[PDB]
Each structure stands twice: as C-alpha cells, then as structure tokens.
Design a protein around this ligand. Sequence first.
Ligand SMILES: CN[C@@H]1[C@H](O)[C@H](NC)[C@H]2O[C@@]3(O)C(=O)C[C@@H](C)O[C@H]3O[C@@H]2[C@H]1O
Length: 250
Amino acid sequence: YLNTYEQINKVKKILRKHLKNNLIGTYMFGSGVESGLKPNSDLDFLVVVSEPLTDQSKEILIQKIRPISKKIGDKSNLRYIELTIIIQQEMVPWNHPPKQEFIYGEWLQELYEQGYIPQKELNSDLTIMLYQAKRKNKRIYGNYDLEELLPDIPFSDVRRAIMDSSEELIDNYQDDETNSILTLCRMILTMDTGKIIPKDIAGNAVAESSPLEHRERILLAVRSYLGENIEWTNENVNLTINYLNNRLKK
Ligand SMILES: CN[C@@H]1[C@H](O)[C@H](NC)[C@H]2O[C@@]3(O)C(=O)C[C@@H](C)O[C@H]3O[C@@H]2[C@H]1O
C-alpha cells in the first residue's frame, strides 16, 4: 500500500498542487525529526501560507489527505498525519495565543465526515509547536527556513502556553488517558530545563521522580503508546493527572 516515504511525498505534492503560490514553505517537526524517526512516530507537518484559505480550499485538503493518513484503529504500518497551516502575516506582531488557519488531525475525523471544515481559530497549543519547530525542523519545500518566517517567540509565552493547555487538559483527560499523562510530564520538563522531549522518555523521567501510585500509572501509559493494549477504565488516572498538574504549577 503506502510506506512513510510515499506519505511524505503525497503530502508534499498535495500542498504544492492545491495551494499554488500561496504556499511559502512546508516543514516537519515533532518527535519525527527530534530524537529520530522511529517506526512508531507520527508525521507532524507545518505549513506556512500567505493568504487565507476559503472553506472549500480547506475542504479539498481534508479530502485528499484523508486516504494518505492512518486511522486510529488501523493496525498497520501507516502513521498519523498531523498538519497545521499558519499565515505569516497573522504571526507578526507576535501575540499569545497565536492564530491558526487550518488543522488536519485524525481525532477530528468524526467531525470531518459530518461536514466540519476547520476554520480560523486561536490555538494556545500552537505556541509550543512553533517554539520547538523553530528549533528543530526539516524543510521539505520552500525558499526560506522556518526561523526567518516567524518572529522571536519569547520563553515567557511558552511557559504560559504550557500551563494554559495544562488546565485545559485536566478537564478533558477522559478517553485520552494514555496521551495526556505523558504530555503533562513533557511539559514538566519543558518548563524546568527547557527541553522538549518525546513523550516516550518524558514519562519515564518523571516516573521514578514521583510517588509509586503515580509511578505505576506513568509507566502504564509508557506501554500503551507502544501498542500494548491497556484498558484505563478501572485505573484511577484522576489522581495522577491531578498530581502532574500540581507538580507543574510553579
Ligand atoms: C496536541 N493536539 C492533539 C490533541 O491533543 C488530540 N486530542 C484529542 C490528541 O489525540 C491523540 O491522543 C489521539 O488519541 C489521536 C492521535 C491521532 O493524536 C493523539 O494526539 C493528539 C494531539 O496531537
């Protein structure tokens, strides 16, 4: 069917074909460029455009990227494709939270079938994305590197972007237990040392640095992201999520 080289290229060509010269650059970030592209990692694309997309231009992007990506239940070699589109002019003057023009994500697929087209939205998670992408990124198209397309984002805004998304996360940990546990730990480290680390090894770092009760649940979420079917319905994630939330507060 498709391997990851084909995935990189069809996504690369879908964007130059259906956005023409509105496309300034397309970049890859996340744990695929950071700490190596393991066969388990996800494909996080970042796309910079000049002018806004009209809803149907955002709709063909959904429909053509749709078969290219891995569905949540897919027990195959395909990996998730997460692409966010930002507009360069909507980025200066810098201001948290930043503006976002488009987003593809497979957690939004149930909404995609019902007719949802991601429209202009303010996302605070985007602040840490651009911060870690300005640092380490792989450019697959464009005449400029990502760092000359975004202003210097201050570390004062990531620290609040960390915590703004923190207490957004404490409310809706439900049904995303495995991922939200490891994300908070990555945020504990990103705001203590300043390094953004894969959630795989971010969990084990705080694991042995935390009480046993939460230690067990941190390591249980280490496995479930590596496959390893784990049913959280009787584990008390509320306690560990409450613990990591307060440990981050500083
Ligand atoms: C940070 N943005 C998203 C967002 O938090 C999603 N929440 C529904 C989150 O969802 C996941 O945990 C999923 O279960 C689905 C997967 C494609 O993305 C994973 O990472 C997804 C994150 O990348």
